RNA sequence: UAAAGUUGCUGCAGUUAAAAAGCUCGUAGUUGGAUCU
RNA sequence: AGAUACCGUCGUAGUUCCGACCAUAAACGAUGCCGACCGGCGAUGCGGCGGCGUUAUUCCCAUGACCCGCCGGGCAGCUUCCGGGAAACCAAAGUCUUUGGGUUCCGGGGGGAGUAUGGUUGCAAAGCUGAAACUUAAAGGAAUUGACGGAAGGGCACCACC
């Protein structure tokens, strides 16, 4: 069973927070992966992008740790990327799955031209950066697919993006920086102010304010 | 205040502020505190505009009152000068006090024993209480601070311009914040003076009392 | 070898070539 | 990599600084780069103060002071242990030791 | 400060600014009438005059050139215009 | 020295918007700057602005609604034909849903969509989204 | 956020900073949503209503959260004049 | 060396925190109560814990203890701390104030107060420290 | 920085022409010394007469006698 | 040929990875402030 | 061990001045110049402006030395999650995939090599311009952890000393 250790975890467990988007609305940190299991656990799929052996030089030989990169996400507009370093590979993979779940961000999807049906591509050109690696996502027409390298393609397919153009600069052989730059670009989709988002923000009650009585009485 | 006659500053409050030295700022002025001062004296001390002080105190009280759980407001003080004031404010208003050392990770590390998740943070000195201010930027925690003329305003959302150096001034301001919070809630009325005199909040410095006793 | 001394040796070779070449 | 923002000297806003000679080795070191020490001492050491005082033909004569200006090149400073290597963060401290 | 009203700055702030960096530039100088104890007419002198201004009806000196404002002689009453 | 006062104006607006400020001072002002600002304002990107009339050259105080992602100039002002407008607006604009390319045209200074409506080309002045 | 038919297709509608009108990202954990209690005009007591101000972490980082919240409160009549 | 180990110190801390009421100032009673209330498998370890318990009790006798906090005595701490002077230190019939704050109060609609007494300003502005 | 002027086409073209010669591949292709020095003379294959059989020692990390022929 | 944004107009670099002339003047070249219903 | 060196005693050219050549330096901020914009703070140099007070100021104002600010141009420094960058770091090395203010020079893996050759300048030394054949899977930058130092500072040890 799951016993929460935070106010957000308790509110989610008690069926008081309706969706993950109510947590995203208030930019609240998610510190328990069981919340993500509660909301998207029936559709989350994780892929191990890389196992990377890192070494620390010691007095007697080389200490070796394993760094697992795990991309998670339902194919319907949520994606996360987690990196975990551990003594053993299996522990690294488990921890990286947990960290990917904890880092899951909402993905905004738009239209390239005319707006028939559901959104298929990125709402506009976005760019993510990580250590000299620059990843640019460009809206693509319907049926284009993802014109990208395999790692950004995995991340973008896991984010529910159907059509995309990709441009990469830097040392994309650094799979970690490539993955983090793609994740950053995908994250910037909902932080980009477009004219359809100009309407004045109407504030609603926070989860920590709406269900204060439940937290106190518990 | 809101241009409300009931919420305007009264004479006895002004005399308390002047006795406590509340309007006495410092020699240095922060560029984000210029809007809260009146003028610099000939000795190099900035005078703090007490009308703006009252406005910010009432704004902080309005922020604190709009927290349904009283314990959700956390009141911090690292310097011993405001420790008793913070403890008395917590006792009177229902806030949760952190007097003394603030352990890093109290907001960001959920494994710690002292882990807590406040909805509002009130600190005495932003410079001395910088650690709770920095950690409030990891957990979406708005912050109220009693800021002097030289106090930095990073991660400070409501700053109350005041002398936060002298024990009288910080104790008086914690007393005023408690009084305004209670008056805004409904407990205790505005038509009679509070039975608690501000001296219950002052840091004593036991040497002075012992030599006096 | 040191770059300055490499350049000095190169200049000595150039002097020898200059004098020998009639 | 660049170790010091000031390049280990004090030459800002000018092109050339006249050199001086190390008081130890006579190395030519630029004046604003040389480590300068002002030694203020007594011509008579502490142990010898009493003998000279009681051999004096005066009363409250007070001993004269010796005024030495030493200029050290960086190698000689480091060897003579007047400056030391410091951590990457302690290097930035230009505050003289309290003495 | 973010929301600093750039259209209507304070007159103290505009007096603090450099004469050219003001919202609408204005000189820091002025024209002043000097009256002498032994004269019947008033002489207009620039506050930052560079010439040695003699008395309009005598040989008495009015102001001395200076790196900045002209130094008035002692004994003549100067009143600023506008 | 200073060439392309429109470049300075647009860069000042860009930097003020990045800093989050609510007003930006633009000097010197010019006719092209005023028309570009009017184009930007008709689409709701800046809001009302005021021209301080010195007796030498204009100044402008532009109120800044926090909607401008980026306003930039294209130097030199390349001549643009209608058939070549799509390539420019595909290189410069973040999306086909929003963002405008400003062109100076015999019919006035105006965005690329209205240039298409008037069936006319011109010289690219800049862009904003 | 709309399609051709008219239905809203966004997953959610993010908040905007009350001081900069920029979108507050879903991972902006330095951003706050201050709740400021409103007060009855005659009694001076919390009347149950409040004004909500969302400030992004960028503004709080540069120290402008103070002045931004003060301006927002002044515009709402919560903070008086002078 | 006679430095107590974190095992002995931690156990004595827990014993003071949880079983304050029974614990006394005598070492031997401390030893007996520690044997009765906790499973301490070694007589030497029992005695080390009891000695640190005794020293901690003397430390509380001195007053505050930095390393521990018991609520059963914290309530009485707050009981003592409720000290109210008979005449408030903020109620002074004469308050000396400078001319500039006098002007500020006059602009604050509090120029008609009666407790304020203007003070002579300093004749110089020599407040900075000599640089160097 | 680079020149951005409506009438800088000559400068841009000349600069590209000059700076293309600093590319190894371009200079090798367009200089003619490589084609003169190429034994095949630009051909993909060539015929020869086997002068002798030689054995070339592999480079230091490896140890083998690669069987080549002088043709 | 693309990959090569490793020739870069779009669109690269020049502190330490390759790199800003020792420094000024200066012709051609390039680029040039507001302003006229 | 050898020293053709470091060290010592000398000591020529040179080091000094004049005239004429040479035109190169880690000639360095290893950072072109002009312009705009984008934080805070305390200093400091020059000029100006304003102001309690102190002092040299001999019936006085000046002015000079201080003190407190302000403005402009400088040499810099500290601080910052402006932003940037591989980072070191940089308030410029920022306002760069949200890529166009103007313009000059200049680089294109490491060597061969600033070499050969031709031209040109110089009395010479040399300076400027400047390859290719061939060879090679790296060379290099920044930072990290170790190991080491004939580097510094602490601690321990009667298998260290006293």
From Swiss-Prot, chain C:
Subcellular location(s) per record: Cytoplasm
Membrane spanning stretches: none
InterPro entries reported for this sequence: Ribosomal_eS32 (IPR007836)
MF (Gene Ontology): mRNA 3'-UTR binding; mRNA 5'-UTR binding; RNA binding; structural constituent of ribosome
Keywords: Cytoplasm, Ribonucleoprotein, Ribosomal protein
Span list, region Disordered: 1-22
One GO cellular component term: endoplasmic reticulum
Family annotation (Pfam families): Ribosomal_L41
A Gene Ontology BP annotation from the UniProt entry: translation
Primary localisation category: cytoplasm
Purpose of the protein: Component of the small ribosomal subunit. The ribosome is a large ribonucleoprotein complex responsible for the synthesis of proteins in the cell. Interacts with the beta subunit of protein kinase CKII and stimulates phosphorylation of DNA topoisomerase II alpha by CKII.
Subunit structure and binding partners: Component of the small ribosomal subunit.
Similarity comment: family membership: Belongs to the eukaryotic ribosomal protein eS32 family.
Note: Initially thought to be part of the large ribosomal subunit. Crystal structures show eS32/eL41 to be a small ribosomal subunit forming a bridge at the interface of the 2 subunits.
Protein name as catalogued: Small ribosomal subunit protein eS32
Gene coding for it: RPL41
Swiss-Prot record, chain G:
Keyword terms: Acetylation, Cytoplasm, Endoplasmic reticulum, Isopeptide bond, Ribonucleoprotein, Ribosomal protein, Ubl conjugation
Main localization, broad class: cytoplasm
Pfam family, one: Ribosomal_S21e
Assembly notes: Component of the 40S small ribosomal subunit.
PANTHER family in the record: 40S RIBOSOMAL PROTEIN S21 (PTHR10442)
GO cellular component terms attached to this protein's record: cytoplasm; cytosol; cytosolic ribosome; cytosolic small ribosomal subunit; endoplasmic reticulum; nucleoplasm; rough endoplasmic reticulum; small ribosomal subunit
GO annotation terms (biological process): cytoplasmic translation; endonucleolytic cleavage in ITS1 to separate SSU-rRNA from 5.8S rRNA and LSU-rRNA from tricistronic rRNA transcript (SSU-rRNA, 5.8S rRNA, LSU-rRNA); endonucleolytic cleavage to generate mature 3'-end of SSU-rRNA from (SSU-rRNA, 5.8S rRNA, LSU-rRNA); translation
This protein's record includes keyword Kinase: no
Gene Ontology molecular function, alphabetical: RNA binding; structural constituent of ribosome
Cross-link (Glycyl lysine isopeptide (Lys-Gly) (interchain with G-Cter in SUMO2)): 41
Described function: Component of the small ribosomal subunit. The ribosome is a large ribonucleoprotein complex responsible for the synthesis of proteins in the cell.
Residues annotated with N-acetylmethionine modification: 1
Subcellular location, record wording: Cytoplasm, Cytosol; Cytoplasm; Rough endoplasmic reticulum
Top-level taxonomic group: Eukaryota
Keyword set includes Ribonucleoprotein: yes
Name of the protein in question: Small ribosomal subunit protein eS21
Similarity comment text for this entry: Belongs to the eukaryotic ribosomal protein eS21 family.
InterPro entries per UniProt: Ribosomal_eS21 (IPR001931), Ribosomal_eS21_CS (IPR018279), Ribosomal_eS21_sf (IPR038579)
Modified residues (N6-acetyllysine): 81
From Swiss-Prot, chain H:
Source organism superkingdom: Eukaryota
Protein name: Small ribosomal subunit protein eS17
Function: Component of the small ribosomal subunit. The ribosome is a large ribonucleoprotein complex responsible for the synthesis of proteins in the cell. Part of the small subunit (SSU) processome, first precursor of the small eukaryotic ribosomal subunit. During the assembly of the SSU processome in the nucleolus, many ribosome biogenesis factors, an RNA chaperone and ribosomal proteins associate with the nascent pre-rRNA and work in concert to generate RNA folding, modifications, rearrangements and cleavage as well as targeted degradation of pre-ribosomal RNA by the RNA exosome.
Modification after translation (UniProt): Ubiquitinated at Lys-102 by RNF14 and RNF25 in response to ribosome collisions (ribosome stalling).
Covalent link location (Glycyl lysine isopeptide (Lys-Gly) (interchain with G-Cter in SUMO1)): 102
PTM-bearing positions, type N6-succinyllysine: 18
Cellular component aspect of the GO annotation: cytoplasm; cytosol; cytosolic ribosome; cytosolic small ribosomal subunit; focal adhesion; membrane; nucleolus; nucleoplasm
Gene that this sequence comes from: RPS17
Organism: Homo sapiens (Human)
Localization per record: Cytoplasm; Nucleus, Nucleolus
NCBIfam families xref list: PRK01151.1
Disulphide bond pairs: none
UniProtKB/Swiss-Prot annotation, chain I:
Residues recorded as bearing 3-hydroxyproline in the entry: 61
Impact when changing residue 66 to K: In BTDD; decreases hydroxylation of the protein; decreases the accuracy of translation; decreases levels of incorporation of the mutant protein into ribosomes and polysomes; patient cells become highly sensitive to oxidative stress
Modified residues (N6-succinyllysine): 53
Sequence ranges of Basic residues compositional bias: 1-19
Cell location: Cytoplasm, Cytosol; Cytoplasm; Rough endoplasmic reticulum; Nucleus, Nucleolus
Location of the region described as Disordered in the Swiss-Prot/TrEMBL record: 1-25
Disulfide pattern: none
Modification comment: Hydroxylation at Pro-61 affects translation termination efficiency.
Function: Component of the ribosome, a large ribonucleoprotein complex responsible for the synthesis of proteins in the cell. The small ribosomal subunit (SSU) binds messenger RNAs (mRNAs) and translates the encoded message by selecting cognate aminoacyl-transfer RNA (tRNA) molecules. The large subunit (LSU) contains the ribosomal catalytic site termed the peptidyl transferase center (PTC), which catalyzes the formation of peptide bonds, thereby polymerizing the amino acids delivered by tRNAs into a polypeptide chain.
Subunit details: Component of the 40S small ribosomal subunit. Part of the small subunit (SSU) processome, composed of more than 70 proteins and the RNA chaperone small nucleolar RNA (snoRNA) U3.
UniProt record similarity statement: Belongs to the universal ribosomal protein uS12 family.
Designated name of the protein: Small ribosomal subunit protein uS12
Organism: Homo sapiens
Residues shown, of full length: 2 to 72 of 143
């Amino acid at each position: 069973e799951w016993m929460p250790v935070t106010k957000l975890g308790r509110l989610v467990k008690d069926m008081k927070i309706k969706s993950l988007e109510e947590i995203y609305l208030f930019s609240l940190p998610i510190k328990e992966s069981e919340i993500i299991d509660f909301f998207l656990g029936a559709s989350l799929k994780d892929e191990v992008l890389k196992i990377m052996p890192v070494q620390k030089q010691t007095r007697a030989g080389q200490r070796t740790r394993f760094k697992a990169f795990v991309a998670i996400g339902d194919y319907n507009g949520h994606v996360g990327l987690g990196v975990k370093c551990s003594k053993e590979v299996a522990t690294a993979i488990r921890g990286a799955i947990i960290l990917a779940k904890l880092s899951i961000v909402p993905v905004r999807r738009g239209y390239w031209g005319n707006k028939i049906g559901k959104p298929h591509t990125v709402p506009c050109k976005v760019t993510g950066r990580c250590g000299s690696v620059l990843v640019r996502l460009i809206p693509a027409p319907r049926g284009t697919g993802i014109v990208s390298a395999p790692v950004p393609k995995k991340l973008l397919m896991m984010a529910g993006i159907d059509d995309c153009y990709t441009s990469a600069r830097g040392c994309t052989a650094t799979l970690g920086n490539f993955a983090k730059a793609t994740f950053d670009a995908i994250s910037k989709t909902y932080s980009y102010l477009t004219p359809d988002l100009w309407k004045e923000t109407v504030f609603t009650k926070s989860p920590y304010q709406e269900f204060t009585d439940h937290l106190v009485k518990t | 205040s809101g241009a409300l006659d009931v919420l305007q500053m009264k004479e006895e409050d002004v005399l308390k502020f002047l006795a406590a030295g509340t309007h006495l700022g410092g020699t240095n002025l922060d560029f984000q505190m210029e809007q809260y001062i009146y003028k610099r004296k000939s000795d190099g001390i900035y005078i703090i505009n007490l009308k703006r002080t009252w406005e910010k105190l009432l704004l902080a009280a309005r922020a604190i009152v709009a927290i349904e759980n009283p314990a959700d407001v956390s009141v911090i003080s690292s310097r011993n000068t405001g420790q008793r004031a913070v403890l008395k404010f917590a006792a009177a208003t229902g806030a949760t006090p952190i007097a003394g050392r603030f352990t890093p990770g109290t907001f960001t590390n959920q494994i710690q024993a002292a882990f807590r998740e406040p909805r509002l943070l009130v600190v005495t000195d932003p410079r001395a209480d910088h650690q709770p201010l920095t950690e409030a930027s990891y957990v979406n925690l708005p912050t109220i601070a009693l800021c002097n003329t030289d106090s930095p305003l990073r991660y400070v959302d409501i700053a109350i311009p005041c002398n936060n150096k002298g024990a009288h001034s910080v104790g008086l301001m914690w007393w005023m914040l408690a009084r305004e919070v209670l008056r805004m809630r409904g407990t205790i009325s505005r038509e009679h003076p509070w039975e608690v005199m501000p001296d219950l909040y002052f840091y004593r410095d036991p040497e002075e009392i012992e030599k006096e006793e | 070898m040191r770059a300055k001394w490499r350049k000095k040796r190169m200049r000595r070779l150039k002097r020898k070539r200059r004098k020998m070449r009639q | 990599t660049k170790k010091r923002r000031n390049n280990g000297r004090a030459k800002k806003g000018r092109g050339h600084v006249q050199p001086i000679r190390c008081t130890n080795c006579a190395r030519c070191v630029p004046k604003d780069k040389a480590i300068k020490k002002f030694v203020i001492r007594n011509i008579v050491e502490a142990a010898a103060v009493r003998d000279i005082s009681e051999a004096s033909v005066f009363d409250a004569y007070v001993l004269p002071k010796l005024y030495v200006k030493l200029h050290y090149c960086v190698s000689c400073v480091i060897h003579s242990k007047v400056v030391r290597n410091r951590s990457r963060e302690a290097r930035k401290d230009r505050t003289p030791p309290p003495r | 400060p973010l929301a600093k009203d750039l259209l209507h700055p304070s007159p103290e702030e505009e007096k603090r600014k450099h004469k050219k960096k003001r919202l609408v530039q204005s000189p820091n100088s002025y024209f002043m009438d000097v009256k002498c104890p032994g004269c019947y007419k008033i002489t207009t002198v620039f506050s930052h005059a560079q010439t040695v201004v003699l008395c309009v009806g005598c040989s008495t000196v009015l102001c001395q050139p200076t790196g900045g404002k002209a130094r008035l002689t002692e004994g003549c009453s100067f009143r600023r215009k506008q | 020295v200073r060439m392309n006062v429109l470049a300075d104006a647009l860069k000042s607006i860009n930097n003020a918007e990045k800093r989050g400020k609510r007003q930006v001072l633009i000097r010197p002002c010019s006719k092209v700057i005023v028309r570009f600002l009017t184009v930007m304002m008709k689409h709701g990107y800046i809001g009302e602005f005021e021209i301080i009339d010195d007796h030498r050259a204009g100044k402008i105080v532009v109120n800044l609604t926090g909607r401008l992602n980026k306003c930039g100039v294209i130097s030199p002002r390349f001549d643009v034909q209608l058939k070549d407008l799509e390539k420019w607006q595909n290189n410069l604009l973040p999306s086909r849903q929003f963002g405008f390319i400003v062109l100076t045209t015999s019919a006035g200074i105006m965005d690329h969509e209205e240039a298409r409506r008037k069936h006319t080309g011109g010289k690219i002045l800049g862009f904003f989204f | 956020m709309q399609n051709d038919a008219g239905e809203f297709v966004d997953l959610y509608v993010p908040r905007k900073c009350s001081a900069s009108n920029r979108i507050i990202g879903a991972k902006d954990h330095a951003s706050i949503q201050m709740n400021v209690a409103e007060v009855d005009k005659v009694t001076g007591r919390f009347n149950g209503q409040f004004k909500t101000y969302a400030i992004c972490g960028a503004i709080r980082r540069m120290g402008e959260s103070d002045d931004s919240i003060l301006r927002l409160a002044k515009a709402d009549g919560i903070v008086s004049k002078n | 060396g006679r430095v107590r180990t974190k095992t002995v110190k931690k156990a004595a801390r827990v014993i003071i925190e949880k079983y304050y009421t029974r614990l006394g100032n005598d070492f031997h009673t401390n030893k007996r109560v520690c044997e009765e209330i906790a499973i301490i498998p070694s007589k030497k370890l029992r005695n080390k814990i009891a000695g640190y318990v005794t020293h901690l009790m003397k430390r509380i006798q001195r007053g505050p203890v930095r390393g521990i906090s018991i609520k059963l005595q914290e309530e009485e701490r707050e009981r003592r701390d409720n000290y109210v002077p008979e005449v408030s230190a903020l109620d002074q019939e004469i308050i000396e104030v400078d001319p500039d704050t006098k002007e500020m109060l006059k602009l604050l609609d509090f120029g008609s107060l009666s407790n304020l007494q203007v003070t002579q300003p300093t004749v110089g502005m020599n407040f900075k420290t000599p640089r160097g | 920085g680079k020149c951005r002027g409506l009438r800088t086409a000559r400068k841009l073209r000349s600069h590209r022409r000059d700076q293309k010669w600093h590319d190894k591949q371009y200079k090798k292709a367009h200089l003619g010394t490589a084609l003169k020095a190429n034994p095949f003379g630009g051909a993909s294959h060539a015929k020869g007469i086997v002068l002798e059989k030689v054995g070339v020692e592999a480079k230091q990390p490896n140890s083998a006698i690669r069987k080549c022929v002088r043709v």
